[PDB]
Amino acid sequence: MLVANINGGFESTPAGVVTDLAEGVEGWDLNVGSSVTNPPVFEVLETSDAPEGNKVLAVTVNGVGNNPWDIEATAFPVNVRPGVTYTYTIWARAEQDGAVVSFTVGNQSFQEYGRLHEQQITTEWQPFTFEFTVSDQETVIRAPIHFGYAANVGNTIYIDGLAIASQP
């Protein structure tokens, strides 16, 4: 089923440490700013525990910064429709319980529809979702997932499930 989010859950991304987050996952790209005082680990892993298929992005967060945007993994490109409502669902799971992450949505106009930053994540896969409709008329959007927080430090956060689909 051609969904709006493609590779949002690292589905086509084959396991293997990433060398360039910008060109790591076709549906997931990462970006580190001067806030990343410590080098985070961006790599894909293949296990039978992933919610979407068996591929996810295992990240090693162990060094936040003075800015609320050290490590950020966004998802794109995404497809939507003007007037139609879409759905947003994702699954997060870190090695040790006590990890925080954020998942917002916004097109290339700095606009945003959904937004759920500051979500507690257990060592298992937690399904989080919500709804959002094209505010203006963006046929393509991207959900920038935030990372680089003290609650996400000393813990590897695996993310997978960022998918956008409308109701049946």
Short mmCIF file of C-alpha atoms in Angstrom, two decimals:
data_model
loop_
_atom_site.label_atom_id
_atom_site.label_comp_id
_atom_site.label_asym_id
_atom_site.label_seq_id
_atom_site.Cartn_x
_atom_site.Cartn_y
_atom_site.Cartn_z
CA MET A 1 0.00 0.00 0.00
CA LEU A 2 1.81 3.16 -1.17
CA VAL A 3 1.65 5.16 2.08
CA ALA A 4 2.54 8.87 2.40
CA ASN A 5 5.68 8.25 4.49
CA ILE A 6 8.29 6.21 2.57
CA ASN A 7 11.10 4.54 4.54
CA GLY A 8 9.86 6.52 7.58
CA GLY A 9 10.58 3.32 9.54
CA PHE A 10 13.92 2.55 7.87
CA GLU A 11 12.21 -0.18 5.82
CA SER A 12 14.29 0.05 2.62
CA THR A 13 17.37 1.00 4.66
CA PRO A 14 19.46 -2.19 5.02
CA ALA A 15 21.15 -2.72 8.39
CA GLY A 16 24.66 -1.24 8.54
CA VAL A 17 26.25 1.69 10.39
CA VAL A 18 25.56 4.98 8.60
CA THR A 19 28.45 7.13 7.35
CA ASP A 20 26.35 10.13 6.27
CA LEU A 21 23.05 10.72 8.10
CA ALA A 22 22.04 13.15 5.33
CA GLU A 23 22.17 10.20 2.90
CA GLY A 24 21.65 7.31 5.35
CA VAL A 25 17.94 6.40 5.27
CA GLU A 26 16.01 7.46 2.15
CA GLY A 27 12.97 8.10 4.38
CA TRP A 28 15.03 9.23 7.40
CA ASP A 29 17.80 11.85 7.43
CA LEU A 30 19.70 13.09 10.51
CA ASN A 31 21.44 16.40 11.22
CA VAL A 32 23.79 17.44 14.04
CA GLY A 33 24.34 21.11 14.94
CA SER A 34 27.02 22.81 17.07
CA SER A 35 24.95 21.64 20.06
CA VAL A 36 26.13 18.04 19.57
CA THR A 37 29.13 18.28 21.92
CA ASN A 38 29.46 14.49 21.74
CA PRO A 39 29.39 12.37 18.58
CA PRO A 40 26.15 10.35 18.56
CA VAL A 41 25.91 6.99 16.76
CA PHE A 42 23.69 6.72 13.68
CA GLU A 43 23.27 3.12 12.48
CA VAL A 44 20.47 0.84 11.25
CA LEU A 45 19.74 -2.55 12.85
CA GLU A 46 17.71 -5.51 11.60
CA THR A 47 15.78 -7.50 14.23
CA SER A 48 12.46 -9.36 14.48
CA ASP A 49 11.33 -6.88 17.16
CA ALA A 50 10.90 -3.88 14.84
CA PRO A 51 7.26 -2.82 14.44
CA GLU A 52 7.50 -1.89 10.74
CA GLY A 53 9.16 -4.87 9.01
CA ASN A 54 12.52 -5.49 10.72
CA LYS A 55 14.67 -2.36 10.30
CA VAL A 56 15.12 0.62 12.65
CA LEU A 57 17.67 3.35 13.44
CA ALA A 58 19.62 2.51 16.60
CA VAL A 59 21.11 5.73 17.95
CA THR A 60 23.61 6.09 20.77
CA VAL A 61 22.81 9.35 22.60
CA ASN A 62 25.46 10.06 25.26
CA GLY A 63 26.23 13.80 25.37
CA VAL A 64 23.64 16.59 25.10
CA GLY A 65 24.50 20.28 24.60
CA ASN A 66 23.28 23.75 25.66
CA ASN A 67 20.81 23.75 22.74
CA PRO A 68 17.53 21.82 22.49
CA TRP A 69 18.50 20.40 19.07
CA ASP A 70 21.82 18.50 19.23
CA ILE A 71 20.77 15.31 17.41
CA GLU A 72 17.73 15.48 15.10
CA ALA A 73 16.45 12.73 12.79
CA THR A 74 13.69 13.96 10.44
CA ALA A 75 11.62 11.83 8.04
CA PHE A 76 11.07 12.68 4.37
CA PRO A 77 9.90 13.01 1.83
CA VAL A 78 6.22 12.57 2.78
CA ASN A 79 3.07 12.75 0.62
CA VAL A 80 -0.31 14.23 1.63
CA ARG A 81 -3.44 15.82 0.11
CA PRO A 82 -5.06 19.25 0.42
CA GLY A 83 -8.38 18.73 2.25
CA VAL A 84 -7.82 15.06 3.11
CA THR A 85 -6.90 14.06 6.66
CA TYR A 86 -3.81 11.91 7.31
CA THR A 87 -2.64 9.81 10.29
CA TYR A 88 0.74 9.79 12.07
CA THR A 89 2.04 6.71 13.93
CA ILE A 90 5.57 5.82 15.13
CA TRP A 91 7.32 3.33 17.45
CA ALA A 92 10.25 4.17 19.74
CA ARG A 93 12.33 1.77 21.86
CA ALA A 94 15.68 2.32 23.60
CA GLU A 95 18.08 -0.18 25.20
CA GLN A 96 17.58 1.06 28.78
CA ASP A 97 14.22 2.48 29.92
CA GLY A 98 14.28 6.23 30.62
CA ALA A 99 14.81 7.75 27.16
CA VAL A 100 12.95 10.77 25.77
CA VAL A 101 12.28 11.70 22.12
CA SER A 102 10.10 14.12 20.13
CA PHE A 103 8.33 13.76 16.76
CA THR A 104 6.84 16.83 15.04
CA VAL A 105 5.59 17.42 11.50
CA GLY A 106 6.12 20.44 9.23
CA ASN A 107 6.44 21.14 5.48
CA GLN A 108 9.26 23.11 3.80
CA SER A 109 7.51 26.34 4.87
CA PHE A 110 8.40 26.01 8.57
CA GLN A 111 4.72 25.15 9.17
CA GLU A 112 3.68 22.28 11.46
CA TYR A 113 0.52 20.15 11.78
CA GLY A 114 1.05 17.42 14.41
CA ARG A 115 3.51 17.62 17.33
CA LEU A 116 4.34 15.32 20.27
CA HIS A 117 7.71 16.34 21.77
CA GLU A 118 8.82 14.97 25.17
CA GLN A 119 7.55 11.38 25.10
CA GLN A 120 8.80 8.83 27.66
CA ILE A 121 10.18 5.73 25.93
CA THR A 122 10.54 2.27 27.49
CA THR A 123 13.04 -0.42 26.51
CA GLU A 124 10.26 -1.91 24.35
CA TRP A 125 8.35 -0.51 21.34
CA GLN A 126 5.74 2.10 22.33
CA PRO A 127 3.13 2.97 19.68
CA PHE A 128 2.42 6.73 19.62
CA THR A 129 0.06 8.38 17.12
CA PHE A 130 -2.15 11.35 16.39
CA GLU A 131 -3.97 13.10 13.52
CA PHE A 132 -3.19 16.16 11.37
CA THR A 133 -4.59 17.66 8.14
CA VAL A 134 -2.73 19.78 5.56
CA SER A 135 -2.97 23.22 7.21
CA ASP A 136 -2.39 25.09 3.94
CA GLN A 137 -1.72 22.96 0.85
CA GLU A 138 1.61 21.13 1.21
CA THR A 139 1.62 18.00 -0.96
CA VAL A 140 4.94 17.05 0.65
CA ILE A 141 5.93 17.35 4.33
CA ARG A 142 8.64 16.16 6.72
CA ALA A 143 8.47 15.28 10.44
CA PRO A 144 11.66 16.40 12.20
CA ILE A 145 12.24 14.03 15.13
CA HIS A 146 14.19 15.81 17.90
CA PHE A 147 17.03 14.12 19.79
CA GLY A 148 19.84 15.24 22.12
CA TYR A 149 18.25 15.57 25.57
CA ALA A 150 19.54 14.70 29.04
CA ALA A 151 16.65 12.23 29.38
CA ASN A 152 17.86 10.61 26.15
CA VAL A 153 21.49 10.50 27.30
CA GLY A 154 23.32 7.37 28.52
CA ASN A 155 20.86 5.35 26.42
CA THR A 156 20.66 4.12 22.81
CA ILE A 157 17.33 5.20 21.28
CA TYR A 158 16.05 3.02 18.42
CA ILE A 159 13.37 4.69 16.29
CA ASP A 160 11.08 3.08 13.71
CA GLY A 161 7.43 3.41 12.68
CA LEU A 162 7.32 7.03 11.47
CA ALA A 163 4.54 6.44 8.92
CA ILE A 164 1.73 8.70 7.65
CA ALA A 165 -1.47 7.10 6.30
CA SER A 166 -5.11 8.21 6.10
CA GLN A 167 -8.08 6.16 7.36
CA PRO A 168 -9.56 3.33 5.28
#
